[PDB]
Amino acid sequence: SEKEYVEMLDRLYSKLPQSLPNMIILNIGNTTIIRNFAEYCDRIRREDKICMKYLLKELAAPGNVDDKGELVIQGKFSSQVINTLMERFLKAYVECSTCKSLDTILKKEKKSWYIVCLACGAQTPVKPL
Amino acid sequence: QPEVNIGVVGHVDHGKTTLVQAITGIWTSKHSEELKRGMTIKLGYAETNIGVCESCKKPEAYVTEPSCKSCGSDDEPKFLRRISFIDAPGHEVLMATMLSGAALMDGAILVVAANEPFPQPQTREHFVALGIIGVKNLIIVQNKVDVVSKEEALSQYRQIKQFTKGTWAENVPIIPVSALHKINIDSLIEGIEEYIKTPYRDLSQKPVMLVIRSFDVNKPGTQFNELKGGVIGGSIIQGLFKVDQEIKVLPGLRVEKQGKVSYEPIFTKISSIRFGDEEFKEAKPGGLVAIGTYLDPSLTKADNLLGSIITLADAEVPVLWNIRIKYNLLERVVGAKEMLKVDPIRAKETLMLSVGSSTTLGIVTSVKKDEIEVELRRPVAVWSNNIRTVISRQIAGRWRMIGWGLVEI
Amino acid sequence: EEQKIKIYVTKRRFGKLMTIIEGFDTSVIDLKELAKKLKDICACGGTVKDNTIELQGDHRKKVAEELVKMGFSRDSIEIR
RNA sequence: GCGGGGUGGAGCAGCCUGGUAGCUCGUCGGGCUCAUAACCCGAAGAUCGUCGGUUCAAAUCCGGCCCCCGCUACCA
Ligand SMILES: Nc1nc2c(ncn2[C@@H]2O[C@H](COP(=O)(O)OP(=O)(O)NP(=O)(O)O)[C@@H](O)[C@H]2O)c(=O)[nH]1
Ligand SMILES: [Mg+2]
Incomplete structure (x- = not known):
């Protein structure tokens, strides 16, 4: 009986270790808006409130999300700094330490959150915030 | 509390502990700082919950946390059992503990390394220990396939499918994994959810x-x-x-x-x-x-x-100093790089008698066909008449598994 | 593990040249018992001198081979 | 981030108390003995990690990195 197995070998191989959509940003008075903040987060398996909370906290500015997944930052910030703070977000909350996949989950327990790689399988413990 | 005891036998550094880490998450610490530069030295320990995605497709349906929304969708996977492992070491000399450990197992998983010469000393030593003691519910696993040629891992599967022949190992399936990137583990959970059934007690x-x-x-x-x-x-x-x-x-x-x-x-x-x-x-x-x-x-x-x-x-329960073993030998010493043929027992010889979890040393007073009488340093409490034992000899400085039998009272 | 050792000739009394063995971890290895065992192998006098063993005569190969027999790494031992 | 240490071939002194580099593994010469050892005397060998600073003078005192070692003792 090889079929069952050969199958198994297939299925693991297809689990090994997707550029990132360019995050569209604009300005309207004194707001900076990330047209696809929703899609973006969506394609990194991360909750909007989270990228929002982080990204906002770092910005030291207020804001919430469109009913149509858009980020309205109550402050007019330069397209650039947004990315700089955004990658930093990726580094600390999405990228696997073991192999750097970016193909991860984000556990949570009493007070310990963990990054969980869908490729390598390892768990980078992160500072719940 | 965990239902069953699954052992993870195998050669050294093939990653036994690592596979345990992809399945549970747990490490065996690697401790005493020594283990931290070396490797597993005490039996490692770890538990886990196995539920299943009813509401979707297998092997992936084989879950780890009450969460199905990982594959197919949500319906909180149904809990089948909670299991426990026993990570042995792999080093040719920790033989005496791994033996010991088996005494607790209800089954096992043989981690072979995909990128090293199949029957490697300890891999065999273990395997035959398994078929000897009684642990008949076995799952072989081809580990380091994340570092090999798609040909190599199949040809090894061959040498395996061929070793697993004359031996007692009919359809002991062989599930190639990647303990490092935790790949294919769910089909492993499906193996171990089929073949390593939970014994009544x-x-x-x-x-x-x-x-x-x-x-x-x-x-x-x-x-x-x-x-x-x-x-x-x-x-x-x-x-x-x-x-x-x-x-x-x-x-x-x-x-x-x-x-x-x-x-x-x-x-x-x-x-x-x-x-x-x-x-x-x-x-x-x-x-x-x-x-x-x-x-x-x-x-x-x-x-x-x-x-x-x-x-x-x-x-x-008897606290013996002297014991009646009935017994049999291997024809070879599967555990030295060299397969030298087992010399029959001479009396007044010192042999490690591995009984239950204990590891005791003793001297041979009687030498018959399959009944020798042994005198022990440290007593053995013999709880049953069914007491399995495992018998070893210091071949070349390091001890070696050579034969077995049954305690007798 | 990681226990290295040096075995070489060391000036002594009557005979020709003693044999010096050093490099053992004295907190784990009892040199007194090791020396007694080595003295039986070489059939010569000897003592533990500080953290070394000194044997009378040239028994470098004998000692090295016995140490391997006793479970010490072949690659941890150097005869000079 | 703390603090200990780089000295003839190996392993250790000498440094806060600046000018004298000492000790053990074999070599060479001379003694002792009838002779071998042992013991004795006389000999070979060190840019003292490096880039500089203070001084009459720096192994030694003050800073700059380069490797070396440890840090308050580990989890049903
Ligand atoms: N590339 C790769 N490396 C792996 C894989 N599995 C384990 N390793 C590596 O193998 C090393 C040995 O891990 P370890 O689990 O200690 O081995 P062990 O067999 O448990 N030691 P012991 O035999 O004493 O229990 C680890 O450093 C790990 O990185 C694998 O599937 N792929
Ligand atoms: Mg290990």
């Missing part, structure tokens, strides 16, 4: 259990007002223990009288019962437990009562 039986660790919980500095009791780690096999029972440990501590030797049974009360990190009021076979006691933690610091057993206080 009559509870009514005599409460009997094996010990393989023991610790002094107490932190460097805890005051005497809250010195937490002595703590005995091991696995139950038959019966069931409950909080507040009266218990004894065998053969138990030996006295000293001017060069004399004399072991004797230790009594105490089960102060407490714990599996993993969660406390329970009772405890039943499959798993390792830990038993809080009321005895001076000096008595079980480093792992003193290693190879000791715990039973019902006021129970009938």
